[PDB]
Design a protein around this nucleic acid. Structure first.
Ligand code: ZN
Ligand code: ZN
Lengths: 126, 128
RNA sequence: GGCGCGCGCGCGCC
RNA sequence: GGCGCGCGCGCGCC
């Protein structure tokens, strides 16, 4: 349906749009685009682990000045290296009303959840 | 012997608070404790945001009597003609007497024991 | 990241 | 007190 914005919960800076969100295995969420990479920084995860289909390499934080709010992790998924965000760190804002809402779990936030597609990235990267 | 009775220990200092046998439930939601033995285990002071709700008149927040703990245990209310303490299971360690196993419950609804309903006749029979 | 629990605390409703 | 929500810190399992 309509498009929404994701704002950092701590500093409230624009993070990304739900239009660029892709769902893996119906439970993990990543964001497509090179623009988004400017929004977060990556750093060594203290306790690296491997679950489901990923290999946890680091945690990502808000790229902003004094913010650095924990946004999620960065992993290895198949032939890719992608960030994985937790809805709990962001504020969802309806673009046409300014109405903001907070979700604790991805399952409680109902929007168009488009599945992650490897062919969708090799088309934008090649 | 009844091997369902449980001890309630202050979560912060581990001191004995009371037994589940002395616990009475008001309106299927609020839990209070019977007897003076329990009255010696806590202290109280006026509540910040309180008073009227349900059939209660929140008259104070109660804490663990141990001067080196003072853990929050609940509140004291005016219920009908009585003045009673109301406790939150979230503040205690549940220890099963028969096996010593300790458990932590965040909600009364999760703690399963023989829940005896509060009854004024009981209150009275013990006052005279 | 998902799920779960713990510790400390704030706010609303009754 | 019950119920809901949020803030900060930590742990377990995958
Ligand atoms: Zn931020
Ligand atoms: Zn204590």
């Amino acid at each position: 349906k309509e498009n929404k914005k994701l704002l950092c919960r701590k500093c409230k800076a624009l993070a990304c749009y739900t239009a660029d969100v892709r769902v893996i295995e119906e439970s993990h969420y990543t964001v497509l685009g090179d623009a988004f990479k400017e929004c977060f920084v990556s750093r060594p995860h203290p306790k690296p682990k491997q679950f489901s289909s990923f290999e946890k390499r680091a945690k990502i934080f808000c790229a902003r000045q004094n913010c650095s709010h924990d946004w999620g992790i960065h992993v290895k998924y198949k032939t890719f290296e992608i960030p994985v965000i937790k809805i709990e760190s962001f504020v969802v804002e309806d673009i046409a009303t300014g109405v903001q809402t907070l979700y604790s779990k991805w399952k409680d936030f109902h929007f168009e959840k488009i599945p992650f597609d490897p062919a969708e990235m090799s088309k934008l990267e090649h």
